[PDB]
Symmetry: C3
Subunit: 226 residues, 3 copies
């Protein structure tokens, strides 16, 4: 089960890569080229790292617990690009952008330590720290980021509502899966944990990628010159 869902990961991310790549190549102006290029690299990075997992790499048995540590290398590289999707579309100020990228990096880094810690009590301390880093990003997104975006696009409030709704719901699912998996309560087997992360990853990357494109189109039409 694990094996097939890793390969579905490779196929999904590779298909996302190709179509974002073709978009980037054909891009009508620099704004569209940039957005297509961010999403291409999110999906390209995820493809290669899913290939490593499918080939049996990036995994260690830590005190008897099978642990896919390469997964956090993927997240550390792809999640800031997903935040750049948001800050690009929102035309976010540098301090709030920096704060979002900082908190997110902190979330993933503490997430990594929470995972690879042999002492699972220490791991679970880091989980809580990581959740607080996520909460920091949630606060920044629904406050400073949203208000800046709404100020920049007064007629497109709903666009950023949809973007933030999808981001916040999908990203909250990750720490829930982490709790269900061998990292936490171990309520689901490795096959199921792998399926959950793969579906999450394809949705949060290819799914959110296409939503980011659709959102750019709506903003472009909404701000079209008379």
């Amino acid at each position: 089960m694990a094996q097939i869902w890793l390969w579905i990961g490779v196929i999904g991310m590779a298909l996302g890569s190709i179509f974002f790549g073709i978009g980037a190549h054909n891009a009508k102006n620099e704004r569209w080229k940039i957005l297509f290029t961010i999403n291409f690299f999110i999906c390209a990075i995820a493809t290669g790292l899913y290939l490593s997992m499918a080939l049996g790499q990036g995994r260690s048995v830590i005190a008897g617990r099978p642990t896919v540590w390469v997964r956090y290398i993927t997240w550390f590289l792809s999640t800031p690009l997903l935040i750049l999707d948001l800050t690009f579309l929102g035309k976010t100020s540098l301090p709030i952008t920096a704060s979002l990228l900082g908190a997110n990096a902190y979330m993933i880094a503490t997430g990594f330590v929470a995972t690879i810690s042999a002492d699972r009590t220490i791991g679970h301390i880091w989980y809580v720290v990581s959740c607080f880093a996520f909460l920091a990003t949630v606060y920044l997104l629904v406050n400073q980021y949203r208000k800046q975006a709404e100020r920049n696009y007064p007629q497109a409030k709903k666009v950023f509502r949809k973007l933030l709704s999808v981001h916040l719901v999908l990203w909250t699912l990750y720490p829930i899966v982490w709790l269900l998996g061998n990292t936490g309560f171990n309520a689901v087997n490795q096959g199921t944990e792998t399926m959950f992360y793969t579906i999450l990853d394809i949705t949060s990357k290819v799914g959110f990628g296409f939503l980011s494109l659709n959102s750019m189109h709506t903003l472009e039409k909404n701000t079209e010159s008379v």
Copy 2:
């Protein structure tokens, strides 16, 4: 002794984080927001990494020598932000900024190798290389950086004198502690080495943070419009 001084580290950096965070949240313009945000992240990074050390992590016994390698992860991330404090306040040109960040990264990277090298002769070669990287930064700071800062703020020469004096004195203490510790002559026990680094870290982060804020206020008042 080691244990308590690691926890004093956590408390100090966490208190620095909170007050810089509150400053950032309340920041009167983008210049103040940026400065508060840089210092928040210096102290936030240091908090989490001091928590890892206090919890017993980030440490290895290398050929019988207890070695806290995570300490250099902290320095590699926080020291460029401290340099950004200087280059932000000094409105430093991109090449000199880049040169400062480059030399500093080189210092910490060679510092790391100097530490984790099992062969202590090779370690001590890397110490000397790291000292020369520091000397490079000293030269850049007291020459190009200072002259640019003085050119930018002709009436605030003393501000940058105070900033550079505190930076140069505090940062020179680090390689001295390194020589006194198990990395060098082992003239002080692990408890004392830990106390020294903690006091240095709180001073160079929270201390220098507040000096950076005070300096910004002086520059803002000095350049206030008639």
Copy 3:
């Protein structure tokens, strides 16, 4: 043989560092300062990492195969700076610059995995992936990069022809050496593999550095105001 050619590496990169450093110090304007500083850091990074290799570091025996993994740390840091040489001189757009840096990072990262993989079949999968990342960069360079450069300097088409010719020929030699070495067919001994990489590295860093300087002079004279 290996040992001497590592030390020739240290001497070559150190000599390149000094002369680029002296250029940077004496630089006539910010454009020359930036170009000199990029090339200084390419050569400075390479010096320190060649010193580590010469001192016997950064090497592991992976399932009986001696493997110099620190070599890919050098390439991961120095190769984007070499790309920055090109994008600086070409005044390349941000998306194409980003695409070049992204593909190059991907090439070196997959190159690294291709090397350290104990399973050499998996290694050779990663080699092919890495070659496709290189091909991506080749496409970007000879298309978008070249056309932007030619648009920016209509009278200096030959300058960028020379830059791209040297880049493409030299960089293609790396995957050939990789195939000849213990990573591939093992058709050459470790002494010869080391000599090849050292000569390549000095040429692609000091050699290309001086070509980048010469190219800047030609562009400056070609665009000199009447």
